[PDB]
Amino acid sequence: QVQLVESGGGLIQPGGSLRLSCAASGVTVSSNYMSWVRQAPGKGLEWVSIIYSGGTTYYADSVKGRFTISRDSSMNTLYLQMNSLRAEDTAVYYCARDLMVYGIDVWGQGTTVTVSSASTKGPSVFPLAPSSKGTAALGCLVKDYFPEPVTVSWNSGALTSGVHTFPAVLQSSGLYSLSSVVTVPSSSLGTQTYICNVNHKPSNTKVDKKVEPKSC
Amino acid sequence: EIVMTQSPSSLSASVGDRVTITCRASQGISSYLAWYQQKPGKAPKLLIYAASTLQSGVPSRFSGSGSGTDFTLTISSLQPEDFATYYCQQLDSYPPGYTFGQGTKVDIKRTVAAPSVFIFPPSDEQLKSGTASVVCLLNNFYPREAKVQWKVDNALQSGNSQESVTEQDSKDSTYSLSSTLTLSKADYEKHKVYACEVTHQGLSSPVTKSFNRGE
Amino acid sequence: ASVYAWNRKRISNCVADYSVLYNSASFSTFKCYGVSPTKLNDLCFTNVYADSFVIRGDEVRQIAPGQTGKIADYNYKLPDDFTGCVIAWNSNNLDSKVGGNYNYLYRLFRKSNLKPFERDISTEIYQAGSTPCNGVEGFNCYFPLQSYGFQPTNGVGYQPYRVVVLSFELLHAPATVCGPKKSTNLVKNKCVNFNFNGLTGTGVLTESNKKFLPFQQFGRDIADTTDAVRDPQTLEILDITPCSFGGV
Amino acid sequence: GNYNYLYRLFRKSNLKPFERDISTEIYQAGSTPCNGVEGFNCYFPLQSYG
Ligand SMILES: *[C@@H]1O[C@H](CO)[C@@H](O)[C@H](O)[C@H]1NC(C)=O
Numbered sequence: 001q002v003q004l005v006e007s008g009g010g011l012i013q014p015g016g017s018l019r020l021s022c023a024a025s026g027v028t029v030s031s032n033y034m035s036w037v038r039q040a041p042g043k044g045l046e047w048v049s050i051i052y053s054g055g056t057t058y059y060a061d062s063v064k065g066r067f068t069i070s071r072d073s074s075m076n077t078l079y080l081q082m083n084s085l086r087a088e089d090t091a092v093y094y095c096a097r098d099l100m101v102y103g104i105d106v107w108g109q110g111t112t113v114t115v116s117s118a119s120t121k122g123p124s125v126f127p128l129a130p131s132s133k134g135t136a137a138l139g140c141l142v143k144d145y146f147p148e149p150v151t152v153s154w155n156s157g158a159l160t161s162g163v164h165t166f167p168a169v170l171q172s173s174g175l176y177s178l179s180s181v182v183t184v185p186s187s188s189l190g191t192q193t194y195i196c197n198v199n200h201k202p203s204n205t206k207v208d209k210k211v212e213p214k215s216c
Numbered sequence: 217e218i219v220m221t222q223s224p225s226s227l228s229a230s231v232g233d234r235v236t237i238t239c240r241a242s243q244g245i246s247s248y249l250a251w252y253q254q255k256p257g258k259a260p261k262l263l264i265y266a267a268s269t270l271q272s273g274v275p276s277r278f279s280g281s282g283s284g285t286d287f288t289l290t291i292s293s294l295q296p297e298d299f300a301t302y303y304c305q306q307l308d309s310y311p312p313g314y315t316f317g318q319g320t321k322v323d324i325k326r327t328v329a330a331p332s333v334f335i336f337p338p339s340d341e342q343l344k345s346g347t348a349s350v351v352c353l354l355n356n357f358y359p360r361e362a363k364v365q366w367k368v369d370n371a372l373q374s375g376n377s378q379e380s381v382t383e384q385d386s387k388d389s390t391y392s393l394s395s396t397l398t399l400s401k402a403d404y405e406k407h408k409v410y411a412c413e414v415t416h417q418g419l420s421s422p423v424t425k426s427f428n429r430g431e
Numbered sequence: 432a433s434v435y436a437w438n439r440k441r442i443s444n445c446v447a448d449y450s451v452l453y454n455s456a457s458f459s460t461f462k463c464y465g466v467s468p469t470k471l472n473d474l475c476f477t478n479v480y481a482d483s484f485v486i487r488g489d490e491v492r493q494i495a496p497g498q499t500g501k502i503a504d505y506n507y508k509l510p511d512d513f514t515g516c517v518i519a520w521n522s523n524n525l526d527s528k529v530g531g532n533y534n535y536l537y538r539l540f541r542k543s544n545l546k547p548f549e550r551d552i553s554t555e556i557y558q559a560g561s562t563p564c565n566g567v568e569g570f571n572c573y574f575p576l577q578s579y580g581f582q583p584t585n586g587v588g589y590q591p592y593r594v595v596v597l598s599f600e601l602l603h604a605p606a607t608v609c610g611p612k613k614s615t616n617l618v619k620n621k622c623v624n625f626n627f628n629g630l631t632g633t634g635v636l637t638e639s640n641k642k643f644l645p646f647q648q649f650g651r652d653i654a655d656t657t658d659a660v661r662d663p664q665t666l667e668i669l670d671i672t673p674c675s676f677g678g679v
Numbered sequence: 680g681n682y683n684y685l686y687r688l689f690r691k692s693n694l695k696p697f698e699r700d701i702s703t704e705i706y707q708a709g710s711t712p713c714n715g716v717e718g719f720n721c722y723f724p725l726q727s728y729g
């Protein structure tokens with residue numbers, strides 16, 4: 001069993017502190033080049049830190065003087081101590097065994113770090129009404145919630161064909177937004193009710209919104 | 217500093233195709249290069265190390281070649297489990313850090329499909345709050361490349377919109393895209409004609425959907 | 432030499448002309464710790480050590496006191512209190528081949544850092560995991576050495592540099608390495624302040640009449656006073672008559 | 680690292696008692712005249728403390 005298992009991630013306000021663990025089996029952490037690599041949403045892998053088997057450590061410029069890599073030989077575990085956290089530290093954090101010229105061959109499953117001043121908030125659910133003008137589109141706008149995730153269904157699961165729930169985007173305000181759409185026959189807009197079901201466990205919010213043709 | 221230039225940003229491939237991905241070092245790095253595979257939500261998987269050596273356990277259809285500045289990855293016969301993102305890494309660089317290529321997404325090839333475009337006005341409920349969201353929908357299209365332009369009273373709007381794309385549909389291999397235009401209620405009520413203009417390979421000429429505020 | 436197997440030449444019992452070194456336009460790195468380069472020619476040491484090897488350009492900065500990295504930790508380590516000079520120059524025209532020069536190797540895997548001036552030439556398989564290796568390579572079982580493979584098209588950071596580390600050791604034993612300590616011309620029949628081989632004084636040097644033995648250097652009068660000297664370069668004996676003086 | 684505190688590293692001769700030297704003339708460590716241009720064997724006499 002050669003694997004790396006990360007833990008310790010979570011949601012934390014800026015300026016807080018967070019300690020990540022990386023438990024290894026098979027690989028001996030203190031006998032290897034061990035790195036921390038992170039990946040921000042939609043961005044590329046960014047190296048954070050590395051500790052040599054002999055004890056030498058290095059850090060990315062962006063984390064110098066705030067992060068500290070370490071290890072416990074008795075626990076065969078790698079650690080990353082993250083102080084003075086900032087919003088732009090938000091990413092999934094991987095631990096990895098580096099073989100230099102032989103590449104990076106063992107990666108963990110990743111732990112997620114989210115740094116934000118945003119207050120937990122349930123979403124507003126607004127209708128995206130089908131236009132008056134063979135098939136019509138309608139949906140729901142799930143705006144201004146935090147943190148991730150929300151799930152959306154239609155007619156309590158009875159409407160699944162043609163449903164597209166988009167990945168959420170982060171707004172300048174630090175809250176998430178998201179839309180769920182479905183395409184349906186124009187001929188049904190008067191005889192078939194469409195309700196979207198929005199669930200956001202962090203805020204204990206379940207909202208059902210009926211989407212109707214708009215009345216000019 | 218050494219720069220890695222990877223191309224293309226995306227390619228489309230059917231199962232059985234020969235795929236080729238290219239990586240260019242801004243100066244000679246000899247054989248100090250590695251190739252990885254990564255799928256949405258998963259960690260990277262090492263494929264080739266030292267430019268041309270096959271990592272243990274990686275299928276033999278993967279192969280790397282090149283030394284100096286120009287490097288290629290090669291998938292001799294693309295399998296269903298090979299649809300992923302791929303990128304190169306300069307090995308043992310200085311200053312410390314991992315320089316990765318920009319990445320190549322390998323999606324499922326299919327016939328061209330033009331999007332269905334729908335525009336949605338802000339709801340009356342939302343307008344009561346102070347913010348107007350305008351949403352433009354691009355439904356079931358292929359390929360992924362698509363350009364959406366918002367126009368407000370024929371003024372091309374940039375800087376106040378965000379886009380979201382789904383993953384390739386597991387049944388018809390299309391994409392769907394949404395675009396959300398956010399305005400203050402006060403600004404929104406200063407203009408009449410709201411439109412998104414969509415250009416796409418499947419459309420002979422840009423398709424525009426619009427509404428007039430209050431109609 | 433390959434950096435892991437760096438070469439060491441022990442230099443003793445000789446005169447060192449350092450003018451050849453510091454006045455050279457052909458070195459790209461030349462950093463001295465604990466000694467001034469120009470002011471080395473008037474110093475004696477008991478031993479000089481010359482360590483030489485090849486590394487990457489990006490690694491040249493690791494040949495210094497208090498540095499870290501694969502070379503300083505696992506290949507060549509200077510002490511924190513280093514008294515010597517590190518000299519380096521680009522040798523891409525020499526130590527790279529078009530197919531890649533794989534003759535130069537470095538240690539890539541080692542459990543702990545080298546002590547200063549330690550030289551590890553072991554080839555034991557490196558146990559990166561829990562189960563042992565027993566000389567068999569494989570996963571978690573890695574040959575400790577790796578090759579640079581210098582190609583001439585490499586950027587400077589990957590091109591080979593030759594490095595020579597001069598260490599200057601001073602023990603409680605007779606010194607055998609000193610610097611040139613040149614001399615000048617000599618003038619006669621004029622009051623001069625003179626410094627012959629080990630003695631110094633003031634006086635007038637004149638052509639002598641004595642017959643010194645082949646091994647005699649310094650004369651001596653009856654009252655334990657220097658009287659004549661043997662010129663170190665010219666095999667001529669010079670009488671030392673103290674410069675004229677008297678009461679006024 | 681505070682580097683506002685400096686120390687002179689080179690000088691053509693030792694200071695006399697209570698002598699003060701604040702000149703920034705380029706020290707010529709080699710045989711090549713510097714002509715006020717820093718470079719190889721042409722150093723700024725001051726160096727910052729770490
Ligand atoms: C010393 O060198 C000079 C020329 O540099 C030469 O004329 C003289 O004979 C030499 N003396 C001895 C003892 O070799």
